[PDB]
Write a protein that binds this ligand. Structure first.
Ligand SMILES: CC(C)Oc1cc(C(=O)N2CCC(N3CCN(C)CC3)CC2)ccc1Nc1ncc2c(n1)N(C1CCCC1)c1ccccc1C(=O)N2C
Length: 125
């Protein structure tokens, strides 16, 4: 099988806006995670073809990655911050579903998730 198309990063039917919280998600949260030593497997969609995982997209029906989130933020795709937070959580959860507890990639995702929650918590009033 081919890979699926990546998640949409624009949609002419979906109202969009810029907000202070969404700006923080791009300038602080995404930027911090993007630069982390463990970011690289998450900076683009899972290429199931390259990685020889014919079942990845049989098991993961809601794929997400930081390259997609980066583009969504840059494109002002979202209406609210909780939509973006959900995208990060989908990304982490997909990793935990496909892989086993304690796997190398799961520990990497767990470290990114800890950092993610810390940056969200730091969002100033
Ligand atoms: C599109 C490209 C990037 O996709 C890749 C490139 C390479 C690969 O062989 N690379 C050469 C060395 C280089 N290093 C060089 C030294 N630098 C210091 C860091 C970068 C990094 C890139 C490996 C995996 C890539 N893609 C990938 N993308 C996503 C992965 C995932 N791997 N892993 C690996 C992830 C690892 C464990 C499971 C998974 C493997 C099996 C099942 C699931 C996953 C998985 O869940 N994820 C998130």
């Amino acid at each position: 099988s081919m890979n699926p198309p990546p998640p949409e990063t624009s949609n002419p039917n979906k109202p969009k806006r810029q907000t202070n919280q969404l700006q923080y998600l791009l300038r602080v949260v995404l930027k911090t995670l993007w630069k982390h030593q463990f970011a690289w497997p998450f900076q683009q969609p899972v290429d199931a073809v390259k990685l020889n995982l014919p079942d990845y997209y049989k098991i993961i029906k809601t794929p997400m990655d930081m390259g997609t989130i980066k583009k969504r933020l840059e494109n002002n795709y979202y209406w609210n911050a909780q939509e973006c937070i959900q995208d990060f959580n989908t990304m982490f959860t997909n990793c935990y579903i496909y892989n086993k507890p304690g796997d190398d990639i799961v520990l990497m995702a767990e470290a990114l998730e800890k950092l993610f929650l810390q940056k969200i918590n730091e969002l100033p009033t």
